[PDB]
């Protein structure tokens, strides 16, 4: 069997406050590229690793990461060997993998379309795209002409939700944390309006300015004070898809008077709809009708920085790490 | 037209904290029992008035007006009508004034008086329709699911528990006294119940009653109770947000902290108002009335007598003096 050096990003310890580079280290080991006898494991060479916000919670003790082992997360990989009938040497796959050059994956999606850049299978064609589609299309049951608000709108998820809303004929407003993200939202992603929540003294007032007749749909990435501001601005029968949250919420009585449906979901419950997502979004990508922006960090050695950078909000759009070229 | 003296319960001032009896007064006016010449109004004699917790909010600056009668749901007899739908002698229920006689702009006609008329302020009126629409529709309940009902001895929660039981759900209720807890289990057939005041830790109390979590929360209370439920919900759990009674007498609301559970447990938490479900009211009556007459569905109300008791009845409600649904009888007829 092939035996190769394997660079890994190890969680050195659980993190309490500011996740920092020094909470991870690079370890170099030797791996044999062989399906373990008996198993239906898959042996892969990792090509891209996604840096996704949910991973931060996994660095603290609560399934969390383990000190001493590689970080894991969504990625794109090429199969080298397989004990699973459905994958063969040479297949391209996306799903959960290790933060390392080669992983052994236990019981993952096969990639069929390679006309698109492979990096997209960490964003629009991967979990963030499926998340936006599940929350917006499935949970909010949106209708043409409805008004839509997205918090953390410059994120991997939010930027898609906004474009999907536009594609449907909705009026769409986004919230973000810098001048440059706000301009990106309007100038690159086609949000009708956007605002820097940091510059507003009164979030409810600011939502009222952009939604004079109220909000039909909130794509919730934030919670707390932002949610309170959304609640008093919702239209009757308004819908809130609770995707992510980052202060006590005081305005829940608005759920009654406005008859709001507020509903949490997890993307992995909707993966049986992924083919039907690919059929909607792939042509849009081709017709240049849905755009995507991303920061690409190069090499595993840059991965600790990239991850801390994402957690920090120090980057524009989706953060990814390219593990190797080709 | 007949002209009669008309006692009225007037809101004297907007209310700060818990209402007191002195926030209201009895006034006596002369009323002409006549349909205003242009209108399709109905002239009614009021027989029963409901005391409902949502009224407490209407007492602060839709809101009630200082100097004017309190208004709310009641049961009344038609004396004169400018509306072909309603005839002299009809019994109706709907919004009316806290007074002996009201002029209403059309309101449900009552057909069955083989039940107590007071029932049309509760089990057969708005609270019963709320329990029905909230549990039967909003909660999408299934046999064998676990159900928690806050303010369970209240007018709405006491029905929710019995509906859940009829479906074969396992049902637990919270109330604010030993007497109300005993009632939930002995009369309303809740599987368990507890006095919220006697629990050091609501989250741990709910874990004890629901080892595997709560499928359905019928929410009447809000606040720390909701936070304790959130951490105890099952996967794809549902919360019908009906009322938040713990919140109505506060200058500012309490912060809810556990909404991250909506994500982890994929909960649907949905507000609703009975106004949107009155299309199901004929279905609800035709189901519930046979059950009432068979003693398969039970109700507990308190009936205070005379308009002069209404302030005390209303204040009492807001502070838990009543067992079950509070009503005021204005008159017999």
PDB file of N, CA, C and O in Angstrom, chain B residues 30-78:
ATOM      1  N   UNK B  30     -78.732  56.626  32.430  1.00  0.00           N
ATOM      2  CA  UNK B  30     -79.994  56.293  31.787  1.00  0.00           C
ATOM      3  C   UNK B  30     -79.701  55.908  30.349  1.00  0.00           C
ATOM      4  O   UNK B  30     -78.931  56.578  29.686  1.00  0.00           O
ATOM      5  N   UNK B  31     -80.247  54.787  29.892  1.00  0.00           N
ATOM      6  CA  UNK B  31     -80.066  54.378  28.494  1.00  0.00           C
ATOM      7  C   UNK B  31     -81.409  54.240  27.777  1.00  0.00           C
ATOM      8  O   UNK B  31     -82.355  53.706  28.347  1.00  0.00           O
ATOM      9  N   UNK B  32     -81.459  54.717  26.530  1.00  0.00           N
ATOM     10  CA  UNK B  32     -82.586  54.504  25.659  1.00  0.00           C
ATOM     11  C   UNK B  32     -82.374  53.167  24.919  1.00  0.00           C
ATOM     12  O   UNK B  32     -81.407  53.003  24.173  1.00  0.00           O
ATOM     13  N   UNK B  33     -83.264  52.207  25.176  1.00  0.00           N
ATOM     14  CA  UNK B  33     -83.209  50.858  24.575  1.00  0.00           C
ATOM     15  C   UNK B  33     -83.691  50.862  23.117  1.00  0.00           C
ATOM     16  O   UNK B  33     -84.747  50.337  22.788  1.00  0.00           O
ATOM     17  N   UNK B  34     -82.898  51.484  22.248  1.00  0.00           N
ATOM     18  CA  UNK B  34     -83.320  51.751  20.875  1.00  0.00           C
ATOM     19  C   UNK B  34     -82.154  51.632  19.905  1.00  0.00           C
ATOM     20  O   UNK B  34     -81.074  52.107  20.187  1.00  0.00           O
ATOM     21  N   UNK B  35     -82.379  50.970  18.775  1.00  0.00           N
ATOM     22  CA  UNK B  35     -81.400  50.927  17.691  1.00  0.00           C
ATOM     23  C   UNK B  35     -81.213  52.355  17.138  1.00  0.00           C
ATOM     24  O   UNK B  35     -82.190  52.982  16.734  1.00  0.00           O
ATOM     25  N   UNK B  36     -79.980  52.895  17.177  1.00  0.00           N
ATOM     26  CA  UNK B  36     -79.708  54.189  16.535  1.00  0.00           C
ATOM     27  C   UNK B  36     -80.293  54.219  15.102  1.00  0.00           C
ATOM     28  O   UNK B  36     -79.966  53.348  14.292  1.00  0.00           O
ATOM     29  N   UNK B  37     -81.162  55.196  14.816  1.00  0.00           N
ATOM     30  CA  UNK B  37     -81.980  55.240  13.573  1.00  0.00           C
ATOM     31  C   UNK B  37     -81.330  54.779  12.264  1.00  0.00           C
ATOM     32  O   UNK B  37     -81.992  54.102  11.431  1.00  0.00           O
ATOM     33  N   UNK B  38     -80.057  55.137  12.051  1.00  0.00           N
ATOM     34  CA  UNK B  38     -79.385  54.744  10.798  1.00  0.00           C
ATOM     35  C   UNK B  38     -78.816  53.328  10.732  1.00  0.00           C
ATOM     36  O   UNK B  38     -78.636  52.769   9.635  1.00  0.00           O
ATOM     37  N   UNK B  39     -78.562  52.737  11.904  1.00  0.00           N
ATOM     38  CA  UNK B  39     -77.627  51.632  12.052  1.00  0.00           C
ATOM     39  C   UNK B  39     -78.227  50.251  11.899  1.00  0.00           C
ATOM     40  O   UNK B  39     -79.444  50.068  11.958  1.00  0.00           O
ATOM     41  N   UNK B  40     -77.342  49.275  11.748  1.00  0.00           N
ATOM     42  CA  UNK B  40     -77.697  47.879  11.928  1.00  0.00           C
ATOM     43  C   UNK B  40     -77.241  47.384  13.329  1.00  0.00           C
ATOM     44  O   UNK B  40     -76.858  46.229  13.504  1.00  0.00           O
ATOM     45  N   UNK B  41     -77.278  48.267  14.326  1.00  0.00           N
ATOM     46  CA  UNK B  41     -76.917  47.891  15.702  1.00  0.00           C
ATOM     47  C   UNK B  41     -77.889  46.934  16.384  1.00  0.00           C
ATOM     48  O   UNK B  41     -79.044  46.808  16.004  1.00  0.00           O
ATOM     49  N   UNK B  42     -77.397  46.271  17.419  1.00  0.00           N
ATOM     50  CA  UNK B  42     -78.232  45.411  18.228  1.00  0.00           C
ATOM     51  C   UNK B  42     -78.240  45.964  19.663  1.00  0.00           C
ATOM     52  O   UNK B  42     -77.178  46.288  20.216  1.00  0.00           O
ATOM     53  N   UNK B  43     -79.430  46.056  20.254  1.00  0.00           N
ATOM     54  CA  UNK B  43     -79.536  46.424  21.677  1.00  0.00           C
ATOM     55  C   UNK B  43     -79.635  45.173  22.541  1.00  0.00           C
ATOM     56  O   UNK B  43     -80.515  44.357  22.311  1.00  0.00           O
ATOM     57  N   UNK B  44     -78.768  45.043  23.545  1.00  0.00           N
ATOM     58  CA  UNK B  44     -78.736  43.806  24.323  1.00  0.00           C
ATOM     59  C   UNK B  44     -78.834  44.034  25.803  1.00  0.00           C
ATOM     60  O   UNK B  44     -78.423  45.065  26.321  1.00  0.00           O
ATOM     61  N   UNK B  45     -79.371  43.039  26.480  1.00  0.00           N
ATOM     62  CA  UNK B  45     -79.274  42.973  27.916  1.00  0.00           C
ATOM     63  C   UNK B  45     -78.171  42.003  28.254  1.00  0.00           C
ATOM     64  O   UNK B  45     -78.265  40.821  27.921  1.00  0.00           O
ATOM     65  N   UNK B  46     -77.167  42.449  28.991  1.00  0.00           N
ATOM     66  CA  UNK B  46     -76.080  41.557  29.354  1.00  0.00           C
ATOM     67  C   UNK B  46     -76.404  40.640  30.519  1.00  0.00           C
ATOM     68  O   UNK B  46     -76.978  41.071  31.528  1.00  0.00           O
ATOM     69  N   UNK B  47     -76.067  39.364  30.363  1.00  0.00           N
ATOM     70  CA  UNK B  47     -76.382  38.336  31.369  1.00  0.00           C
ATOM     71  C   UNK B  47     -75.105  37.842  32.055  1.00  0.00           C
ATOM     72  O   UNK B  47     -75.069  37.736  33.266  1.00  0.00           O
ATOM     73  N   UNK B  48     -74.032  37.558  31.289  1.00  0.00           N
ATOM     74  CA  UNK B  48     -72.743  37.137  31.905  1.00  0.00           C
ATOM     75  C   UNK B  48     -71.588  37.871  31.267  1.00  0.00           C
ATOM     76  O   UNK B  48     -71.622  38.107  30.073  1.00  0.00           O
ATOM     77  N   UNK B  49     -70.545  38.135  32.036  1.00  0.00           N
ATOM     78  CA  UNK B  49     -69.302  38.712  31.519  1.00  0.00           C
ATOM     79  C   UNK B  49     -68.119  37.854  31.892  1.00  0.00           C
ATOM     80  O   UNK B  49     -68.031  37.358  33.035  1.00  0.00           O
ATOM     81  N   UNK B  50     -67.214  37.668  30.943  1.00  0.00           N
ATOM     82  CA  UNK B  50     -66.014  36.921  31.200  1.00  0.00           C
ATOM     83  C   UNK B  50     -64.967  37.811  31.839  1.00  0.00           C
ATOM     84  O   UNK B  50     -64.899  38.992  31.535  1.00  0.00           O
ATOM     85  N   UNK B  51     -64.175  37.254  32.751  1.00  0.00           N
ATOM     86  CA  UNK B  51     -62.942  37.916  33.228  1.00  0.00           C
ATOM     87  C   UNK B  51     -61.783  37.146  32.625  1.00  0.00           C
ATOM     88  O   UNK B  51     -61.590  35.966  32.969  1.00  0.00           O
ATOM     89  N   UNK B  52     -61.062  37.764  31.695  1.00  0.00           N
ATOM     90  CA  UNK B  52     -60.023  37.086  30.904  1.00  0.00           C
ATOM     91  C   UNK B  52     -58.712  37.802  31.146  1.00  0.00           C
ATOM     92  O   UNK B  52     -58.679  39.054  31.242  1.00  0.00           O
ATOM     93  N   UNK B  53     -57.639  37.022  31.315  1.00  0.00           N
ATOM     94  CA  UNK B  53     -56.305  37.569  31.630  1.00  0.00           C
ATOM     95  C   UNK B  53     -55.801  38.588  30.588  1.00  0.00           C
ATOM     96  O   UNK B  53     -55.140  39.556  30.971  1.00  0.00           O
ATOM     97  N   UNK B  54     -56.137  38.429  29.303  1.00  0.00           N
ATOM     98  CA  UNK B  54     -55.653  39.395  28.258  1.00  0.00           C
ATOM     99  C   UNK B  54     -56.148  40.818  28.550  1.00  0.00           C
ATOM    100  O   UNK B  54     -55.541  41.797  28.092  1.00  0.00           O
ATOM    101  N   UNK B  55     -57.257  40.934  29.303  1.00  0.00           N
ATOM    102  CA  UNK B  55     -57.819  42.258  29.653  1.00  0.00           C
ATOM    103  C   UNK B  55     -56.838  43.123  30.430  1.00  0.00           C
ATOM    104  O   UNK B  55     -56.918  44.352  30.400  1.00  0.00           O
ATOM    105  N   UNK B  56     -55.945  42.480  31.166  1.00  0.00           N
ATOM    106  CA  UNK B  56     -54.997  43.210  32.000  1.00  0.00           C
ATOM    107  C   UNK B  56     -54.119  44.128  31.158  1.00  0.00           C
ATOM    108  O   UNK B  56     -53.797  45.263  31.583  1.00  0.00           O
ATOM    109  N   UNK B  57     -53.734  43.670  29.967  1.00  0.00           N
ATOM    110  CA  UNK B  57     -52.913  44.469  29.052  1.00  0.00           C
ATOM    111  C   UNK B  57     -53.704  45.687  28.564  1.00  0.00           C
ATOM    112  O   UNK B  57     -53.173  46.805  28.438  1.00  0.00           O
ATOM    113  N   UNK B  58     -54.994  45.483  28.301  1.00  0.00           N
ATOM    114  CA  UNK B  58     -55.828  46.584  27.793  1.00  0.00           C
ATOM    115  C   UNK B  58     -55.954  47.743  28.793  1.00  0.00           C
ATOM    116  O   UNK B  58     -56.528  48.791  28.478  1.00  0.00           O
ATOM    117  N   UNK B  59     -55.414  47.545  29.991  1.00  0.00           N
ATOM    118  CA  UNK B  59     -55.505  48.519  31.071  1.00  0.00           C
ATOM    119  C   UNK B  59     -54.308  49.463  31.168  1.00  0.00           C
ATOM    120  O   UNK B  59     -54.184  50.183  32.150  1.00  0.00           O
ATOM    121  N   UNK B  60     -53.447  49.454  30.152  1.00  0.00           N
ATOM    122  CA  UNK B  60     -52.255  50.313  30.106  1.00  0.00           C
ATOM    123  C   UNK B  60     -52.152  50.999  28.739  1.00  0.00           C
ATOM    124  O   UNK B  60     -52.587  50.442  27.725  1.00  0.00           O
ATOM    125  N   UNK B  61     -51.622  52.223  28.721  1.00  0.00           N
ATOM    126  CA  UNK B  61     -51.437  52.963  27.466  1.00  0.00           C
ATOM    127  C   UNK B  61     -50.055  52.700  26.884  1.00  0.00           C
ATOM    128  O   UNK B  61     -49.896  51.819  26.043  1.00  0.00           O
ATOM    129  N   UNK B  62     -57.801  49.866  20.838  1.00  0.00           N
ATOM    130  CA  UNK B  62     -57.346  48.597  21.402  1.00  0.00           C
ATOM    131  C   UNK B  62     -57.346  48.655  22.940  1.00  0.00           C
ATOM    132  O   UNK B  62     -58.025  47.856  23.573  1.00  0.00           O
ATOM    133  N   UNK B  63     -56.600  49.591  23.532  1.00  0.00           N
ATOM    134  CA  UNK B  63     -56.637  49.798  24.990  1.00  0.00           C
ATOM    135  C   UNK B  63     -58.040  50.284  25.431  1.00  0.00           C
ATOM    136  O   UNK B  63     -58.776  50.810  24.600  1.00  0.00           O
ATOM    137  N   UNK B  64     -58.428  50.069  26.697  1.00  0.00           N
ATOM    138  CA  UNK B  64     -59.652  50.651  27.266  1.00  0.00           C
ATOM    139  C   UNK B  64     -59.459  52.167  27.424  1.00  0.00           C
ATOM    140  O   UNK B  64     -58.324  52.626  27.645  1.00  0.00           O
ATOM    141  N   UNK B  65     -60.547  52.934  27.391  1.00  0.00           N
ATOM    142  CA  UNK B  65     -60.432  54.370  27.683  1.00  0.00           C
ATOM    143  C   UNK B  65     -60.918  54.684  29.094  1.00  0.00           C
ATOM    144  O   UNK B  65     -62.052  54.366  29.443  1.00  0.00           O
ATOM    145  N   UNK B  66     -60.049  55.321  29.906  1.00  0.00           N
ATOM    146  CA  UNK B  66     -60.444  55.895  31.190  1.00  0.00           C
ATOM    147  C   UNK B  66     -61.760  56.661  31.028  1.00  0.00           C
ATOM    148  O   UNK B  66     -61.960  57.331  30.024  1.00  0.00           O
ATOM    149  N   UNK B  67     -62.663  56.539  31.990  1.00  0.00           N
ATOM    150  CA  UNK B  67     -63.969  57.162  31.883  1.00  0.00           C
ATOM    151  C   UNK B  67     -65.060  56.387  31.157  1.00  0.00           C
ATOM    152  O   UNK B  67     -66.242  56.766  31.236  1.00  0.00           O
ATOM    153  N   UNK B  68     -64.688  55.297  30.458  1.00  0.00           N
ATOM    154  CA  UNK B  68     -65.649  54.505  29.683  1.00  0.00           C
ATOM    155  C   UNK B  68     -65.813  53.077  30.270  1.00  0.00           C
ATOM    156  O   UNK B  68     -64.955  52.603  30.983  1.00  0.00           O
ATOM    157  N   UNK B  69     -66.934  52.396  29.960  1.00  0.00           N
ATOM    158  CA  UNK B  69     -67.083  51.025  30.463  1.00  0.00           C
ATOM    159  C   UNK B  69     -65.929  50.143  29.974  1.00  0.00           C
ATOM    160  O   UNK B  69     -65.427  50.301  28.851  1.00  0.00           O
ATOM    161  N   UNK B  70     -65.485  49.267  30.845  1.00  0.00           N
ATOM    162  CA  UNK B  70     -64.699  48.083  30.435  1.00  0.00           C
ATOM    163  C   UNK B  70     -65.534  47.314  29.385  1.00  0.00           C
ATOM    164  O   UNK B  70     -66.772  47.423  29.381  1.00  0.00           O
ATOM    165  N   UNK B  71     -64.860  46.627  28.452  1.00  0.00           N
ATOM    166  CA  UNK B  71     -65.560  45.800  27.476  1.00  0.00           C
ATOM    167  C   UNK B  71     -64.842  44.423  27.455  1.00  0.00           C
ATOM    168  O   UNK B  71     -63.677  44.306  27.919  1.00  0.00           O
ATOM    169  N   UNK B  72     -65.526  43.395  26.963  1.00  0.00           N
ATOM    170  CA  UNK B  72     -64.903  42.060  26.822  1.00  0.00           C
ATOM    171  C   UNK B  72     -65.984  41.093  26.416  1.00  0.00           C
ATOM    172  O   UNK B  72     -67.120  41.512  26.170  1.00  0.00           O
ATOM    173  N   UNK B  73     -65.668  39.792  26.431  1.00  0.00           N
ATOM    174  CA  UNK B  73     -66.652  38.794  26.040  1.00  0.00           C
ATOM    175  C   UNK B  73     -67.750  38.605  27.068  1.00  0.00           C
ATOM    176  O   UNK B  73     -67.520  38.551  28.271  1.00  0.00           O
ATOM    177  N   UNK B  74     -68.949  38.414  26.563  1.00  0.00           N
ATOM    178  CA  UNK B  74     -70.056  38.146  27.479  1.00  0.00           C
ATOM    179  C   UNK B  74     -71.160  37.397  26.760  1.00  0.00           C
ATOM    180  O   UNK B  74     -71.016  36.996  25.611  1.00  0.00           O
ATOM    181  N   UNK B  75     -72.251  37.207  27.467  1.00  0.00           N
ATOM    182  CA  UNK B  75     -73.414  36.492  26.960  1.00  0.00           C
ATOM    183  C   UNK B  75     -74.562  37.469  27.241  1.00  0.00           C
ATOM    184  O   UNK B  75     -74.637  38.044  28.353  1.00  0.00           O
ATOM    185  N   UNK B  76     -75.433  37.663  26.249  1.00  0.00           N
ATOM    186  CA  UNK B  76     -76.439  38.713  26.314  1.00  0.00           C
ATOM    187  C   UNK B  76     -77.716  38.277  25.590  1.00  0.00           C
ATOM    188  O   UNK B  76     -77.723  37.296  24.796  1.00  0.00           O
ATOM    189  N   UNK B  77     -78.824  38.908  25.928  1.00  0.00           N
ATOM    190  CA  UNK B  77     -80.095  38.640  25.237  1.00  0.00           C
ATOM    191  C   UNK B  77     -80.453  39.844  24.366  1.00  0.00           C
ATOM    192  O   UNK B  77     -80.436  40.991  24.824  1.00  0.00           O
ATOM    193  N   UNK B  78     -80.837  39.585  23.124  1.00  0.00           N
ATOM    194  CA  UNK B  78     -81.249  40.675  22.208  1.00  0.00           C
ATOM    195  C   UNK B  78     -82.573  41.321  22.616  1.00  0.00           C
ATOM    196  O   UNK B  78     -83.583  40.622  22.785  1.00  0.00           O
TER     197      UNK B  78
END
